[PDB]
Design a protein around this ligand. Sequence first.
Ligand SMILES: O=C(O)[C@H]1O[C@@H](O)[C@H](O)[C@@H](O)[C@H]1O
Ligand SMILES: O=C(O)[C@H]1O[C@H](O)[C@H](O)[C@@H](O)[C@H]1O
Ligand SMILES: [Cl-]
Ligand code: NA
Length: 694
Amino acid sequence: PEVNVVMTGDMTTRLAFAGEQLKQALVEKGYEVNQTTDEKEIKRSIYLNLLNDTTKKNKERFDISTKGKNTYVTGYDGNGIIYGCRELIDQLDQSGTMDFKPVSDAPEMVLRGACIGLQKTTYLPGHAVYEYPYTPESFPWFYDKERWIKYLDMMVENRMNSLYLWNGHPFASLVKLKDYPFALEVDEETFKKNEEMFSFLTTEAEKRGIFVIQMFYNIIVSKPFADHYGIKTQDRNRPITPLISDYTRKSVAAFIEKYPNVGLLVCLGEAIGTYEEDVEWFTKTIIPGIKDGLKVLGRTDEPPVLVRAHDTDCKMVIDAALPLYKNLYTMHKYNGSSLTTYEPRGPWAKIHKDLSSLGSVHISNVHILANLEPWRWSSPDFIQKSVKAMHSVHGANALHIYPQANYWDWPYTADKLANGEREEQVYRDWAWYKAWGRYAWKADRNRLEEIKYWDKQFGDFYGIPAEMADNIRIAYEESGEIAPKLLRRFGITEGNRQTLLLGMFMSQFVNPYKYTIHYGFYESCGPGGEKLIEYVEKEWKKQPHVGELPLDIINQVIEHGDKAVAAIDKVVSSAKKNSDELRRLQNDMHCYREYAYAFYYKVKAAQHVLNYHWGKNMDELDKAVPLMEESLKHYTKLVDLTKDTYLFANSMQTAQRRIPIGGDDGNNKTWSEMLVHYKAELYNFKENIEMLKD
Ligand SMILES: O=C(O)[C@H]1O[C@@H](O)[C@H](O)[C@@H](O)[C@H]1O
Ligand SMILES: O=C(O)[C@H]1O[C@H](O)[C@H](O)[C@@H](O)[C@H]1O
Ligand SMILES: [Cl-]
Ligand code: NA
């Protein structure tokens, strides 16, 4: 049939994009589309009306009404019209028809976005941590315009309005300083490509209602700057110097001037020695450079500057900066560098609440996902309860998500495909982005309706009836509890210093404090409860148990694993689309189940070892041995499941990875390597037992 798309109001880039998305989606569903503004032609019509203003009240709001063959979309701003068209397109995909239900809606969280890291699995030669110039050699994908469009369209589809680029020192790839011409860290040809890609990225983001934000760490200078002056690129023990202050102030002023719509996300770390130096750097170097740039542009607005809480005293920094610059946003990790709970609490919740209490935008950062690497994860139930806690426990009104896994190896997942081919994170992790977007838009959605929604999404992706597709949801929601529960109850850290899914040594259960556990982790990252060492000590001292108990958690986790496997195994014979991906999701569920069993058996071994330390009964060490053997049988099966299907587990392939073992020079990033260590663990344990009897 013939359909009119009628764009009224002053034509803006976002109204044009909205109308073109609607046109393209109508044509895909087989309609003929007339784009017209003529009363004489305007037969079946959709009117896109963009309103002028309406202030914070109506930010990103749309109204859809229908009277028979006519549909009216009112967008309160450019994002609103884009989201109104999204609502129609979502309805057109779910039905197959232009029978539209009226909707009036607007997002709960005011910034909803994801990050890409201009980062790699290992350091570049001559460079320290986080230091990567923007070059085609390091980041060929950064220069791929077709890849950017696919990424930005995924962000619009999930109603995300913010994209963050993470880099240690981006300025020396992006701006030239006449006072420090030698500082530039890329050749002229690459400098011109970087300018073009920034102009492309900001233009394509802008028409999609996406705020581009450049993240930078401090204090870091370019390699050629450092070599010119005979100094280090970065040194936490190096105090603020006038020279480095001037370079950085001018770098920041140049960036503001050259890329006037790009936000800044400031980390006052990890190369600043003290909180007083954090404040001094932010208030006397960065803010003056931002003000310098705005003054060059003749701008009297204060666009938002975003400040991380990470490695600083965020409240102390904001309290000092607010007199100089009013428009400050905060950001703080949701569960440190992992995803552990939808019941956060404790001292880290109090940092959230104190930043939330400034009455600005406080951004929850779902950061790094150390405990999820590298297997598929995207539990609608877990993500919904987490966003609810972001509101109810943290007072966050905004969301920043990392990639679900494999942050340091963008744009690919850790999957090993048959071809030598790499799997795209955008393709694999579609439900991660979709779920975070969905709940950031609206957290309180009826759970029975959400089950129907997700059953249909999974069913459509795999060409399975919604009813059969319920097994895909169950696999995600059962498997999704495993890495969060095990890390919070037995982890050394929520940091990427640990790679949970490579497993743990029995010693890390028996003597966890040897491996350095920081205050705040156990106190913040889930329900109150007992470590295995605490549980066993209380058993011997006949003290009552309180909270989340470790033997309860390993029991729940093996049930999660078995239920995930049972669910996903029911659908593989049925999938008519994306079958090869379904086979990889099936394999990931078998990985989680073998992982859970290996973990279960090793914790039970550790309990016997702790019983020996308290009571000195040798029978306890004899009981531990067959449990460590069953642990190794499950871990051996996990190696067989990962051998042909994963490149590695941790994407941060450096000596900063300590748990379960050192990751120096990219070693011990595979289950195969860890099986060598765990065999030796068993042989060494049996030797210790023989020595103690003799
Ligand atoms: O490795 C670790 O344990 C630590 O890493 C630090 O960067 C972080 O600020 C801590 O919360 C902790 O996760
Ligand atoms: O928050 C941050 O920037 C950092 O936090 C931890 O130190 C983590 O090990 C780093 O890899 C980085 O993610
Ligand atoms: Cl943060
Ligand atoms: Na700091």
